[PDB]
Design a protein that fits this description.
part of a larger assembly, 2 chains, 2 helices, Phate tail tape measure protein (chain B)
Chain lengths: 49, 49
């Protein structure tokens, strides 16, 4: 019970850290999608010209 | 870009050709009118007038 309490404690931190940090990694995909979006503006711009 | 700048050159060399129509074509129109016609009439006068 004690050793599992300790190991579930560490597993708590070592899953919270990924599931938060890689949510900010989902935000990474958002930021990168916004870069695709930004260059998808330059396409119409020079298109229009 | 390398369409549009050259579309620009295409428009500019359209315009340059199109101004050169006005000067070249009138260049032909003026080749004979100011030159042969009246002189032929004067030579008709001296021949036969």
């Amino acid at each position: 019970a004690a050793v599992s309490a300790l190991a579930i404690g560490t597993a708590g931190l070592l899953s919270q850290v990924p599931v938060v940090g890689e949510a900010m990694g989902g935000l990474g995909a958002i930021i990168d999608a916004l870069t695709m979006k930004i260059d998808e503006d330059a396409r119409p711009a020079v298109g229009s010209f | 870009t390398d369409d549009l700048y050259e579309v620009a050159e295409a428009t500019y060399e359209a315009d340059s050709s199109l101004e050169a129509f006005q000067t070249a074509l009138d260049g032909v129109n003026t080749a004979i009118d100011d030159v042969a016609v009246s002189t032929l009439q004067t030579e008709i006068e001296e021949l036969t007038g």
